[PDB]
Ligand binder design. Structure first.
Ligand SMILES: [Cu+2]
Ligand SMILES: [Cu+2]
Ligand SMILES: [Cu+2]
Ligand SMILES: [Cu+2]
Ligand SMILES: [Cu+2]
Ligand SMILES: [Cu+2]
Ligand code: NA
Ligand code: NA
Ligand code: NA
Lengths: 314, 310, 310
């Protein structure tokens, strides 16, 4: 069926950690997506600035949500102030470079192309301009969720989380604007490992929020470029894991691998209030390089699941 | 309320016996944190921080739906506080906040084991990486309500990476090296705390024809293990320690802060070698264990060298 | 006893024909270990240690329940002994002890392939890591008794990490660098022994509409691959080379000393890139292959650039 004969729907995309609403369609549609590539200076950590290359102004790019069988029409613009061309490779797309050749766009230009989402899953998209590693390492990646035809189960809370490793010339903590360091990248020796582009992006005042009793689903991406994440939530167990973001489901998992350029979906029920910490359990990444997020859960205590310190004695 | 049962815990590589119970119970566990100097390798000493005096901590075995009440003691000679985060526990820090214990003090708390699996537990005192890197980790097995299938031999194996200021082989007491840890460049990668801890005279033992199950933990702090047994194939793998079962696997990933269960039947006698198949860890950094199998040879499965010609 | 059959082995990226046998057989395999200098990249030489003259070794294909008889020769020009450990073999060293062969000698031994799967084989002479790092690894496929599903194209792909004294790009003969190996800091990461071994004029080839299966091994010694095909999605993944099947996976882990099988149908023409998606390995260290697919375009699946405006 030609895509021009399908009803046209403007995509609802979200900035991390938000997720677009679930799709209540039982028929294919032509989904129009607008993306802009912007090079901009942002805060990586306290007193540390970095020149990010972004989809739509932050890291990761905005999340896209479509249904298996949809045609995705992408209007791809590269901001005039950009120093280099950019494009996008959708791991959800079947064909040359996942769309990279069709979306090769110089600064001040706009490209359009479309692809059919043939297979459900949770797919990384990222820039593929040479040198690809640099474009990825500077923050050009995001997730597109392709729902199964029948949809996914309903859950109370959904979060959008993408891990990435960053390579600065100075050591972590070195102040000022820090340029990209190709040698550390080739050596796979990052200074920062973060969720959603920046240290503390989903921690402290920016923590994720939920209420006791709610079911939580996390769409977890790994833009890399290099590291593989042992993803874990302190204080919780994964009721379900879509292994490597695929169809296969594992259960009762404490820590699951997220491949580089890959993904995973994890689900768990937050039973009792508390502060839950997302980490890459290659643990020195979490507590020394920034691979640390927080989930605030409010509600009524339940001693039957866990008690506090009942006593301390000599 | 629930009947109270004293936990049977075991020092690696031993495993507690399977649970013959069909009802929930309150299982009492005693844990002590002890800082002590032990041998890492020939002529190399290390200041370990341990649960119950060695690395890994003692294995705990409970049943889905049990209440686990932990009596947590910190030796008076300890220099810092310690606690425990059970990946099996649901709630704040897996119990870390409730078990924050200064030297010479005892804490108690409890949690219900809601989900079966094989869960790492470890200290979570800041700086978390250092407490883990010094050896404070172990495994707790939460059986399914119906139990696990019977096997002849069960082993308790936990990999960890260690960071010494001196190069591997440097003699004497070797302090923890924060810079190498942050860089993820360990000097030692071992099973159960020390080079040779389950090799040579400390090898695991079985008999030909017996079914073997290994509960494999990875305390990290940083490395991911490509776990493999030289000379054998995994008939079953509980993927990442979860419910999903894989079969006919030669090498399986054990995530950092994660686990795996593998099963295989040892068909013929011989020495079978446990390794992290990121192989320079095994044969240069110490990630090497041995399973000695006794019994009658069988040429139909494998022969010795049949001929040597020019 | 058993009928005797001479093995059909293949040079990468080719795969032996599927087995149309419904009965067990004695499959005779001849292997020779050869040390030889070859091109790693433009103007870069390396002293490879090989099974049968290249990296990886030739692929072996047998049926579950077969007896594999190996005639193992070590070329007289070799400087050290070599052997082979089959991850498919059950028993001492996977055959390493039985095939320990000095230069100019020949060893024979046999093993029964008890379990189906896709198994790494590699040399295990001390120092094991160096023998592997110099290129001594390959794959043996043990079919299930009922065989595998039919596919149009089958490819044989093995990733390996290499450790040279000089930085990648340094011209001339590059010796093995033990220090970088222990640090797991490779200069080259390649498919099938060399930069470009399956790219450009050596690219893999298929036709639009064909189903493709890749037998993907990771000889290591150290790295774990996030295997990905740019422009495609894995319809099927035999997780870690085992019996378990995943679907709709973009990137799958290949453990060190492990394997994976992936399947996908190439719908439209184009150049598809095999990479380790630890992406600096692909575009800076050489872990890059190409699958060129010819056929008729289909804008319904993907279009070219439809417009370029201001
Ligand atoms: Cu770009
Ligand atoms: Cu990609
Ligand atoms: Cu501690
Ligand atoms: Cu933990
Ligand atoms: Cu050799
Ligand atoms: Cu091996
Ligand atoms: Na829960
Ligand atoms: Na066996
Ligand atoms: Na396809």
């Amino acid at each position: 069926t030609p895509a021009g004969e399908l009803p046209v729907i403007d995509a609802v995309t979200t900035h991390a950690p938000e997720v677009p609403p679930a799709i209540d369609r039982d028929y294919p549609a032509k989904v129009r997506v607008k993306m802009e590539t912007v090079e901009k200076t942002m805060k990586m950590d306290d007193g540390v600035e970095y020149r990010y290359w972004t989809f739509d102004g932050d890291v990761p790019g905005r999340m896209i949500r479509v249904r298996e069988g949809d045609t995705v029409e992408v209007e791809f613009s590269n901001n005039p102030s950009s120093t280099v061309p950019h494009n996008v490779d959708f791991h959800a797309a079947t064909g040359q470079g996942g769309g990279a050749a069709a979306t090769f766009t110089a600064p001040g230009r706009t490209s359009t192309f479309s692809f059919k989402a043939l297979q459900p899953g949770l797919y990384i998209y990222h820039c593929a301009v040479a040198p690809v590693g640099m474009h990825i390492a500077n923050g050009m990646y995001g997730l597109i969720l392709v729902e199964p035809k029948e949809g996914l189960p309903k859950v109370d809370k959904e979060f959008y989380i993408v891990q990435g490793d960053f390579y600065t010339k100075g050591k972590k903590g070195a102040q000022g604007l820090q340029p990209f360091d190709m040698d550390k990248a080739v050596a796979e020796q990052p200074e920062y490992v973060v969720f959603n582009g920046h240290v503390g992006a989903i921690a402290g005042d920016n923590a994720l929020k939920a209420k006791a009793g709610e079911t939580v689903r996390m769409y977890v991406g790994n833009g890399g470029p290099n590291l593989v994440s042992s993803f874990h939530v302190i204080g919780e167990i994964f009721d379900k894991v879509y292994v490597e973001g695929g169809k296969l489901i594992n259960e009762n998992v404490q820590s699951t691998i997220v491949p580089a350029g890959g993904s995973a979906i994890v689900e768990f029920k937050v039973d009792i209030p508390g502060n839950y910490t997302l980490v890459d359990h290659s643990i020195f990444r979490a507590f020394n390089k920034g691979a640390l997020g927080q989930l605030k859960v409010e509600g009524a205590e339940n001693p039957e699941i866990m008690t506090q310190k009942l006593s301390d004695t000599a």
